[PDB]
Design a protein around this ligand. Structure first.
Ligand SMILES: [Cl-]
Ligand SMILES: [Cl-]
Ligand SMILES: [Cl-]
Ligand SMILES: [Mg+2]
Ligand SMILES: [Mg+2]
Ligand SMILES: [Mg+2]
Ligand SMILES: [Mg+2]
Lengths: 181, 181, 181, 181
């Protein structure tokens, strides 16, 4: 079937139909992959507004959104609040331990879960999910392993593409309402 | 029909001939859609100096400039003040309201209004205005709907491109004076 | 003759031999064209490190560097302070007034001056210098007016390219010394 | 000879096998070369998180990591502290002096040392090491001097590429554990 980013396989479209939960990586997926650091200890990161719209569409379209992260950075919390993301696991050695608790807390099967990644630490979780996604400019070794590879880059609208995919496959796209924030 | 950005249709030029008001979204139009967020609630947005020049030219050549955006930040007011933009609406995802307020306060028919946007949230207003513009890298679903697609990406001089177009259509480009600020 | 950016005309090379002073624009030449603003009135601009190396070379090679800019900004002052740029003109409406005052203060003729600009306000001065330069991604209407059009974009090493050219033209590139700061 | 970024020469792979120390430049190598400066003395620099993971991998796989940079900023110390780089030299433009101190302190030969650079100031050291690396978007004059030129630009994963290269040559890539931070 066709999408506004180009055609996708029937298999990928079938996986996208069943997703109840979308897990997102922060750095290199939601952001341009950079961490901005100051002399007085400031730490800034950038998120894509059009990604936000996709995320808010997904949340109003009965798709839950979650984030798994290595270190408890306050900005990610603030960003989650802005978009209304209540599921934020921070300070995570494994992404597997956080992944298991998410499935317990929501009683959702692994095949009903999508994950978007960009580096090799993202894989162990992507191996077990229903739809595994790698961003266009993800690490060369992650790309061939994922079920789907986005056309758009990390922090440039790749998350929007996946949201857009999940909506289309589930036939909620035309009616989906979000905020570009 | 000739512009410094490439050929444009007689229809778009005839539409641009009549613009008394230029409405702009911020994120993905006046910026590349990025939001920088810090660990102490620091927010940063990036604006384009040549977009500024074009806005200055537009305002000194009897064309009003307005802004309607979904987010709300002090920095946006500051940029507005720097450029002499007196009409701004923030924290608004139903953009039809702010738009209707503008049609009242400036006594201006909707077909004398140009609107530049990048996401689907912008379209409700774009459908009603005289000249609707989508930026080169606007969300793929917006692009086919617009009257004119800019050559230049949001945050890189798409606004400048749009200001350039109106001024040329009104015979004002040659003389127009601005400050690249 | 040939350079590390591609061949250049005999004329452009001949003009570069005589350059004793290189005037630079800040926005869109030394910067990515962007101005980063914040909620507590913060303002940040980005400068390229390899531009630093070039400016340092030029200054130790009997080529003065000057900047004409429309505002006062401490960040610019600090940038000039880092690279040893003493001649900084701040708050200039016209650039011609600053250009005359620069010419009289240094006892240097118009043909020994080079200017690197990116927008239509740089032209009134660019017209009067020996070597005028528009950066790769300058406003489309400025590009055909310049003597030389850089291969590298504004804020990416365009200034380095112009330093690299001046130096080579004067037989100083091989022996030049700078710091990538 | 096959990597995930593409084929490298047999000589480069033999060189990479013997690397026991990796020396990095910061500006233009670990970053895209931009320096963010503000009105209050705020300074920012962007590092690449996937670069971090490579460095973390190199450090945990018996390959020491060191930094010599022309600039001086507390922010760099923060970065090295996060990644675990104990060997750091700032405000050092004659980079040979730090290079001398490094070999002396680690009791290690130059032919076991690898250097990634982006500008000419990086060459006097690069000339002496066993594996010299220019980034994809290094200065045109540095590119042909290096043993190897990365496929990825500085600050987009050029350092990660080199980390992947050493690890592969030393058979340590598959098992290498790091953190994308
Ligand atoms: Cl919006
Ligand atoms: Cl200017
Ligand atoms: Cl350096
Ligand atoms: Mg990541
Ligand atoms: Mg928008
Ligand atoms: Mg300028
Ligand atoms: Mg450097």
């Amino acid at each position: 079937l066709a999408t506004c980013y180009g055609p996708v396989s029937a298999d990928v479209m079938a996986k996208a139909e069943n997703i109840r939960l979308l897990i997102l990586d922060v750095d290199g997926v939601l952001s341009d992959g950079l961490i901005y650091m100051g002399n007085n200890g400031e730490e800034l990161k950038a998120f894509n507004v059009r990604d936000g719209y996709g995320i808010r569409c997904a949340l109003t379209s009965d798709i839950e959104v979650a984030i798994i992260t290595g270190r408890k950075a306050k900005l990610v919390e603030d960003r989650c609040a802005t978009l209304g993301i209540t599921h934020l696991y921070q300070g995570q050695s494994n992404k597997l331990i956080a992944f298991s608790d998410l499935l317990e807390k929501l009683a959702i099967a692994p095949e009903n879960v999508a994950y978007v990644g960009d580096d090799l630490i993202d894989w162990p979780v992507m191996e077990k999910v229903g739809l595994s996604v790698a961003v266009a400019d993800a690490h060369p070794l992650l790309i061939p392993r994922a079920d789907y590879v986005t056309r758009i880059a990390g922090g440039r609208g790749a998350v929007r593409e996946v949201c857009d995919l999940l909506l289309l496959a589930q036939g909620k796209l035309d009616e989906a309402k979000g905020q570009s924030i």
